[PDB]
DNA sequence: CCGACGGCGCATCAGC
DNA sequence: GCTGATGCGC
DNA sequence: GTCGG
Ligand SMILES: Nc1ccn([C@H]2C[C@H](O)[C@@H](COP(=O)(O)OP(=O)(O)OP(=O)(O)O)O2)c(=O)n1
Ligand SMILES: [Mg+2]
C-alpha cells in the first residue's frame with residue numbers, strides 16, 4: 061500500500077508477459093520485484109533507489125522513473141488499447157484457460173464473457189466450471205468465512221476417520237484477513253513415504269464433503285490432489301454464499317513439514333526459498349529436502365522434524381508464516 | 387554480457 | 403493401453 | 413527482466 065502504484069504496474073506487466081507473450085520467466089522476474097518493492101519500507105522516490113533492491117534491474121528502473129513522473133506507463137497504456145492483447149488477458153481470468161487456449165479462442169472469434177457462454181461446448185470440463193463460477197471466483201473470502209470453512213472441513217474429516225489431520229494452509233496460515241481460496245493439507249497414518257495401506261484415502265473425504273453439500277463441484281481429482289468448488293451453507297431468506305475454490309493436497313504423514321512449508325507459501329516465498337536452497341546446495345520440493353550431490357544430482361532425503369530444520373539446512377533464520385507473505 | 391530461471395499433480399492430446 | 407510432451411494450477 | 417559466470 062506504500063508503493064501501490066509501482067507494485068500494481070509491475071504486476072500488470074507480469075500478467076501481460078505471462079498471458080500474452082507467454083514469457084514465464086519475464087513473468088516471474090516482474091513479480092519478484094513486485095514483492096521486494098512491496099516489502100520495501102519507504103515510498104520509493106526514484107528508479108535508482110529502486111534498482112538497489114534485488115530483482116530490480118535497469119528496465120524496471122526506467123519504468124519506475126516514468127511512472128513516478130507521468131503517473132502512467134506508455135508501454136502499459138498501449139497494451140490496454142490493443143484489443144487482441146487485452147482480449148487474451150480477460151480469457152485467462154477463467155480457471156482452466158491459460159495463455160494458449162485463450163489465444164486460440166481469439167483466433168476463433170471467442171473474445172468475451174458472452175462468447176464463452178454461447179460456445180460452452182468448445183470448453184473442456186475445468187474451463188466450463190471456471191466460467192460457471194467466474195463471477196464468484198473474483199471475490200475474496202474474509203477470515204470469518206475461512207474459519208467457518210475450517211470447522212466443516214475438519215469436523216467432516218474426523219467423521220470419516222479420526223486419525224486424519226487437516227491443515228488449512230495458504231494465506232490463511234499466514235494470518236491474512238482475507239484469502240483467495242481454501243488450501244487444505246491432509247495427512248493420514250495409512251499413507252507414508254514408502255507404504256500405502258489404503259487406496260481411497262482422498263476419495264473418502266471428498267465424497268463425504270460432497271455428501272454434506274459442501275463440495276459442489278470437482279475441477280481435477282487425483283489420488284493425492286484435488287481442485288474443486290465448495291460453499292458455506294446459508295440460513296433462511298439469506299442470499300447464498302459465493303461458491304469458493306478449494307484445493308486439497310494429501311501429503312504422506314512423515315513428510316508433513318515439507319508439505320506444509322509448500323502449501324503455506326507464498327509462491328513468491330517458495331520461489332525465493334527453493335532458489336536459495338539450490339544455491340546452498342539443496343533442492344526443496346513439497347515432499348522433502350535433498351542435497352545436490354557432487355554432480356548436481358539430488359541425493360537422498362535429509363531428516364526433518366520441523367519446519368525450522370528446513371530453514372536451518374539452507375542457513376536461513378526461521379520466519380513465521382505471518383512473515384512469508386511475499 | 388549471454389542465458390539460465392522452483393517443483394510437481396491432473397488433464398489432454400499424439401504417437402505407437 | 404502405455405509413454406511422454408504440453409496446458410494449467412497450486 | 414535480472415543478474416551471475
Ligand atoms: N507455483 C506455485 C503456486 C503456489 N505455490 C504455493 C503458494 C501457496 O501457499 C500455495 C497455493 O495457494 P494459493 O494458490 O491458493 O494462493 P495463496 O493461498 O498463496 O494465496 P491466496 O489464496 O490468498 O491468494 O502453493 C507454489 O509453491 N508454487
Ligand atoms: Mg490460497
Ligand code: NA
Pocket residue numbers: 110111112113114115116117
Ligand atoms: Na537490482
Ligand code: NA
Pocket residue numbers: 151152153154155156157158
Ligand atoms: Na485462467
